Amino acid sequence: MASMKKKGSVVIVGRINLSGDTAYAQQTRGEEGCQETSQTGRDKNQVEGEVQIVSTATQTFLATSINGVLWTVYHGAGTRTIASPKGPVTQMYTNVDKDLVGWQAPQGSRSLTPCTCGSSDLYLVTRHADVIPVRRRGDSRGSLLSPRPISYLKGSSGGPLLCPAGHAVGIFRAAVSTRGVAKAVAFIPVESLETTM
Numbered sequence: 001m002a003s004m005k006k007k008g009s010v011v012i013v014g015r016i017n018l019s020g021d022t023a024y025a026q027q028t029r030g031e032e033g034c035q036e037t038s039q040t041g042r043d044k045n046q047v048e049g050e051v052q053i054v055s056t057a058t059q060t061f062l063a064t065s066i067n068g069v070l071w072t073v074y075h076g077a078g079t080r081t082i083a084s085p086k087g088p089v090t091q092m093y094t095n096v097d098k099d100l101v102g103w104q105a106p107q108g109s110r111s112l113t114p115c116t117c118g119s120s121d122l123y124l125v126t127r128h129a130d131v132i133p134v135r136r137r138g139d140s141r142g143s144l145l146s147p148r149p150i151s152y153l154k155g156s157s158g159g160p161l162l163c164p165a166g167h168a169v170g171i172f173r174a175a176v177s178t179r180g181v182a183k184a185v186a187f188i189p190v191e192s193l194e195t196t197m
């Protein structure tokens with residue numbers, strides 16, 4: 001009881017820059033400053049962009065702003081708060097059944113717009129700033145046009161699947177692999193986010 005520890009906050013440690021012609025990852029905080037920010041929940045760094053790279057003490061993954069909510073996966077964040085300039089921010093959405101959590105989008109973030117195109121030609125954005133073409137195959141599944149080892153997708157849960165026009169279609173949740181090769185991905189459809197809201 002006296003020694004009861006508390007888990008740290010999720011910390012923004014970088015972002016995927018989709019501003020220009022070339023997508024690229026940027027780190028905005030090193031491990032040590034991430035360690036201290038997770039403990040205090042106090043993050044003074046300027047936030048920019050739609051796709052953040054986030055980290056706990058033991059995991060790193062992505063988080064994506066859609067309609068004023070920073071979304072990510074429950075299997076990464078659990079019920080953790082996120083660090084912010086004035087302290088830990090409690091989740092405003094939690095759904096273990098969808099593998100989904102959300103906090104209010106940070107000041108300075110930009111939000112993606114929910115897709116209403118009805119298109120099945122999608123693009124998955126990874127933590128290494130790869131933009132991977134994906135054909136939608138169902139409400140929550142898409143196939144990679146070019147399969148690759150799951151190693152290349154590890155750490156990209158919470159990232160977005162986008163339509164051709166750059167709208168958010170879903171949040172990357174899991175990889176479907178055969179012999180360690182990712183042939184398809186499962187994602188939380190944006191409609192399921194909009195219902196949660």
Ligand SMILES: COc1ccc2nc(C)c(O[C@@H]3C[C@H]4C(=O)N[C@]5(C(=O)NS(=O)(=O)C6(C)CC6)C[C@H]5/C=C\CCCCC[C@H](NC(=O)OC5CCCC5)C(=O)N4C3)nc2c1
Nearest residue numbers: 059061075076096099150153154155156157173174175186
């Ligand atoms: C605890 O409470 C909950 C509640 C609901 C939950 N719901 C799901 C689906 C779930 O799955 C866990 C976590 C998830 C995952 O690894 N996600 C990725 C990632 O990158 N994570 S991560 O960022 O590195 C990190 C771990 C740091 C956060 C994108 C993957 C990239 C590579 C995967 C390689 C090896 C894993 C293949 C596996 N495949 C699979 O399960 O496929 C089946 C499900 C649908 C199709 C069939 C898979 O993908 N996952 C296993 N845990 C849950 C836990």
Ligand SMILES: [Zn+2]
Nearest residue numbers: 115117163167
């Ligand atoms: Zn669209």
